[PDB]
Amino acid sequence: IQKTPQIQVYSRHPPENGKPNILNCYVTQFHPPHIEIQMLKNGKKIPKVEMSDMSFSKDWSFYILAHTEFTPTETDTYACRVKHDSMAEPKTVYWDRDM
Amino acid sequence: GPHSMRYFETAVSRPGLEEPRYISVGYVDNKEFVRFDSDAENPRYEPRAPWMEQEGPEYWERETQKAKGQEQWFRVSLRNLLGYYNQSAGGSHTLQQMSGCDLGSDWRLLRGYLQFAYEGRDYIALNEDLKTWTAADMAAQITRRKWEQSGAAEHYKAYLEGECVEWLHRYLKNTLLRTDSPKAHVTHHPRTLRCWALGFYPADITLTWQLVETRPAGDGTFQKWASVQNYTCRVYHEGLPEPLTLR
Amino acid sequence: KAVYNXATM
Ligand SMILES: [Cl-]
């Protein structure tokens, strides 16, 4: 069975304008492993995003963590875009600095 | 305290190339320390943790060479499984192995792990006794029968009780025995309070009131929230004198 | 240290 992924975008620290941070995009519970992840700053692919080495959970579904250091803006949006066999077209999930 | 070693190995065949891609990732106490990728510069075992580079060259010459053996082993089984499940060519199929040892209190063995999955479903697993197998599909009944005539569980128990726990010791002796403990905030926004537990290590945490999965924060520590003024939020983590409260 | 697999599937 193929399993559509599970996207979660979140910050390392509570965001405050001017203080460095990490932005995470955590995608889990998917199969097959082949997957494409790109983090976006206002619709622009962030140049060099550090990604984890893919492992898999106890139920054998694969998970992978994409993160990048960043220092946020209150009038800037951040999103994660995934492409996988289980989806027709890519899925984009935005940050939501509140919660 | 509790200690563990794990090796998550994965082999993916795809309709494009002839040899499948084989990746092995090792974990000591749920931190990644060694990796092997067959799609690489020169496929080899590389340290994924700073404390692990002081290992010596003989160490990586064996592991890389043993990894090359595993990958062939996975190449052969995948082809074997196409027949077992009457799959014709034209698809992509995944074989996964999870293996390792949970230590404890006395640096003794608690439970061994040897299990395989095909197409991300359970295929065969060594039981708690380390001497008998469990096989879900009938297609795996074949394998159980021949691994029983193979004496395969004997080799694996020798590993789990042998080099697994011995080599877990020496890695441990070499950042790991430390504890980062959570910063606790609560989001005061409505339509519904929301408790935050940030920057803790390890990942075993628990939150309740008077839900989302614990996840890595991108820097080696973890994060979690719970969703819900007569209510209180209690935090429970290993590195905690007593569980912390916040309303 | 990784494990070496005996008999295949
Ligand atoms: Cl299923």
Residue B68 and residue B146 share a domain:
yes
Q: Distance between CA atoms of A57 and A42, rounded to whole angstroms?
A: 32
Q: Distance between CA atoms of B246 and B199, rounded to whole angstroms?
A: 17
Q: What range defines the domain where residue B71 resides?
A: 3-174
CATH of the domain at B27: 3.30.500.10
Alpha helices (H) in B18-151, listed in sequence order: 57-84, 138-150
Residue B146 and residue B66 share a domain:
yes
- Do A37 and A81 meet the contact criterion of CB atoms below 8 Å apart? yes
Q: With CA atoms as reference, report the closest residue to B71 among B26, B25, B37, B105.
A: B37
Residue B135 and residue B43 share a domain:
yes
User: How does DSSP classify residue B100?
Assistant: E
Q: Distance between CA atoms of B46 and B40, rounded to whole angstroms?
A: 11
User: How does DSSP classify residue B50?
Assistant: G
Last residue of a domain, one of B119, B141, B174: B174
Give how far Cα B65 sits from Cα of B22, B104, B178, Å: 14, 30, 33
* Token pair 């890695």 in the structure block, residue: B171
Q: Do A33 and B119 touch (CB under 8 A)?
A: no
- Do B52 and B171 meet the contact criterion of CB atoms below 8 Å apart? yes
Residue B111 and residue B203 share a domain:
no
User: Chains touching chain C at 3 or more Cβ pairs under 8 angstroms?
Assistant: B
Residue B24 and residue B92 share a domain:
yes
Q: Distance between CA atoms of A46 and B163, rounded to whole angstroms?
A: 43
Q: With an 8 Å Cβ cutoff, is A8 touching chain B?
A: yes
Backbone phi, then psi, for A77, in 5-degree steps? -110, 150
Give the total number of structural domains in chain B: 2
Residue B41 and residue B76 share a domain:
yes
Q: How far, rounded to the nearest angstrom, does the alpha carbon of residue B4 sit from its chain's CA centroid?
A: 10
Residue B20 and residue B102 share a domain:
yes
B226: helix, strand or coil:
strand
Q: With an 8 Å Cβ cutoff, is B167 touching chain C?
A: yes
The C-alpha R_g of chain A, in whole angstroms, comes to 14
Residue B220 and residue B160 share a domain:
no
Q: With CA atoms as reference, report the closest residue to B198 among B184, B212, B187.
A: B184
Instruction: Indicate the resolution in Å.
Output: 2.6
Q: Distance between CA atoms of A14 and B34, rounded to whole angstroms?
A: 32
Please report residues of B whose CB lies closer than 8 A to that of C6.
147, 150, 152, 155-156
* Token pair 């139920």 in the structure block, residue: A59
* Domain boundaries along the sequence of chain A: 1-99
CATH of the domain at B194: 2.60.40.10
Within 10 A of B220 (CB to CB), how many other CB atoms are there?
Answer: 12
Residues 66-125, chain B: which have Cβ within 8 Å of A? Answer: 92, 94, 96, 117, 119-122
Residues 1-9, chain C: which have Cβ within 8 Å of B? Answer: 1-9
Contacts 24+ apart (CB under 8 A), B75-79: B75/B11, B75/B19, B75/B20, B75/B22, B76/C8, B77/B11, B77/C8, B77/C9, B78/B11, B78/B13, B78/B20
- Do B104 and B3 meet the contact criterion of CB atoms below 8 Å apart? yes
Residue B198 and residue B101 share a domain:
no
Last residue of a domain, one of B149, B174, B199: B174
Within 10 A of B158 (CB to CB), how many other CB atoms are there?
Answer: 12
Give kind and range of the element (H or E) at residue B157.
Answer: helix B152-159
Residue B197, strand partner residues:
B184, B224
- Do A27 and A63 meet the contact criterion of CB atoms below 8 Å apart? yes
- Do A66 and A81 meet the contact criterion of CB atoms below 8 Å apart? no
Residue B217 and residue B128 share a domain:
no
At what angle are helices B138-150 and B152-159 packed, to 10 degrees?
80
**Please, which residues have CB within 8 angstroms of residue B84's CB and are 6 or more apart in sequence?**
B139, B140, B142, B143, C9
Residue B169 and residue B59 share a domain:
yes
Q: Distance between CA atoms of B157 and B113, rounded to whole angstroms?
A: 9
Residue B45, strand partner residues:
B36
Residue B128 and residue B198 share a domain:
no
